[PDB]
């Protein structure tokens, strides 16, 4: 057997252009005119981008351009937007009723502005406090590039224990979102002055400090 | 769009069978056979394991079976093996131009007890409001297996605009942690009565509500 070749990664500058090559075999690609292209957004419910060599499905992003250059197929993305970061796959009909896929090309847009995160800290709410627990939530958001680190400050001494953070995910953007959580007993929470969520990103640091005077 | 409602997580053990399901909203159903199922491992290209409701392609192990009745196609891994563990998707060809995808699933071969998520909705802290910002967080924590559906609601009606959902992170107890957020204005927040964060894990829904109670 075999599964179509794709170049594992395809960069381009902003507003520019890239072309990915789904490359097959006489028995599949070049056998028939039935190559579709797929946009699989950083691990997501994938969509169809082309169906037959160069036909843009009923509501596609402006200028996905499909090519079949013998047994090499090509998808040309131009007017480069940030949102084109994805997993690009192709599929060609091979024989008896069935389709063959390709390796999988990750598309990379360059020239994306670096953004420093919006740290929103949270005090626990009444309900949680009634239910008898306290969990604090640092929300880091709209950052680029997606490397951030979260310290917790118990009260100006650190609190390594009871913290839990998340790997940054891409938004309907190409900005990331992350969060830390500190799980506390309410007791512990009446019992002392400040809590702090310190977030470092590309040199910057943003600290947010919360105090027990939450209203409800 | 994802008008093919697919479960968030589907899990079993070796030798236990698992149904994935794929529901259509589609004013379509009946006038239909063309429902194709895809087996997709993390790292690999997507590969079809079912075409036209019940036909697997060449080399699909016997255990995969598809069905469709009502508006529901179903895929039964009949006797679960290790690398049945993958992302699964479904499909429907509204002829040519309109290739509707389902939203995905996951096959978890459990080797950890099932953990239904802790939801913990936090409302626009008084400070953030004092900055004329509005954001409520839906912490989803301690869930296994690490796939979960998240949806929001204002005054009953669902909210789509402004919600960003992170990807399940593995925690220092091999259970999972996600977060959504709804970004708003004090206006929109204050101008309502109740906001649910609604979360779906396997065969479970947790809906937690926050009301605007406006201390400053």
């Amino acid at each position: 057997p075999s599964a179509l070749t794709q170049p594992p990664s395809a960069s381009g500058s902003l507003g520019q252009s890239v072309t990915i090559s789904c490359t097959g075999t006489s028995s599949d690609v070049g056998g028939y005119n039935y190559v579709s292209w797929y946009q699989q957004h950083a691990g997501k419910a994938p969509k169809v981008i082309i169906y037959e060599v160069n036909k843009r499905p009923s509501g596609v992003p402006d200028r996905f351009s499909g090519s079949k250059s013998g047994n090499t197929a090509s998808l040309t993305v131009s007017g480069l937007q940030a949102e084109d970061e994805a997993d690009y796959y192709c599929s060609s009909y091979e024989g008896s009723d069935n389709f063959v896929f390709g390796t999988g090309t990750k598309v990379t847009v360059l020239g994306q502005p670096k953004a420093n995160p919006t740290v929103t800290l949270f005090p626990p709410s009444s309900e949680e406090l009634q239910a008898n627990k306290a969990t604090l939530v640092c929300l880091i958001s709209d950052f680029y590039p997606g490397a951030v680190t979260v310290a917790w400050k118990a009260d100006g001494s650190p609190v390594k224990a009871g913290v839990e953070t998340t790997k940054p995910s891409k938004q309907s953007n190409n900005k990331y979102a992350a969060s830390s959580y500190l799980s506390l007993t309410p007791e512990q929470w009446k019992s002392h002055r400040s809590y702090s969520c310190q977030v470092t990103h590309e040199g910057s640091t943003v600290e947010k400090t919360v105090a027990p005077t939450e209203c409800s | 769009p994802s008008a093919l409602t697919q479960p968030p997580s589907a899990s079993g053990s070796l030798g236990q069978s698992v149904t994935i399901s794929c529901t259509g909203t589609s004013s379509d159903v009946g006038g239909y056979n063309y429902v194709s199922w895809y087996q997709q491992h993390a790292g690999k290209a997507p590969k079809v394991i079912i075409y036209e409701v019940n036909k697997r392609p060449s080399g699909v192990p016997d255990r995969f079976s598809g069905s469709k009745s009502g508006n529901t196609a179903s895929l039964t891994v009949s006797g679960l093996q290790a690398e049945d563990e993958a992302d699964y998707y479904c499909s429907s060809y509204e002829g040519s131009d309109n290739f509707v995808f389902g939203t995905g699933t996951k096959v978890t071969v459990l080797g950890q007890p099932k953990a239904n998520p802790t939801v913990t909705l936090f409302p626009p802290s008084s400070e953030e409001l004092q900055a004329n910002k509005a954001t409520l967080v839906c912490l989803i924590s301690d869930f296994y297996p690490g796939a979960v559906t998240v949806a929001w609601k204002a005054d009953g009606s669902p909210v789509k605009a402004g919600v960003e959902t992170t990807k399940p992170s593995k925690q220092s107890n091999n259970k999972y942690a996600a977060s959504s957020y709804l970004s708003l204005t004090p206006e929109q927040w204050k101008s309502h009565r109740s906001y649910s964060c609604q979360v779906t894990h396997e065969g479970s829904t947790v809906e937690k509500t926050v009301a605007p109670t406006e201390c400053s």
Binding site: Y34 | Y51, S91, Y93
Partner: peptide
């Protein structure tokens, strides 16, 4: 993959 629909086609067919």
């Amino acid at each position: 993959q629909x086609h067919x």
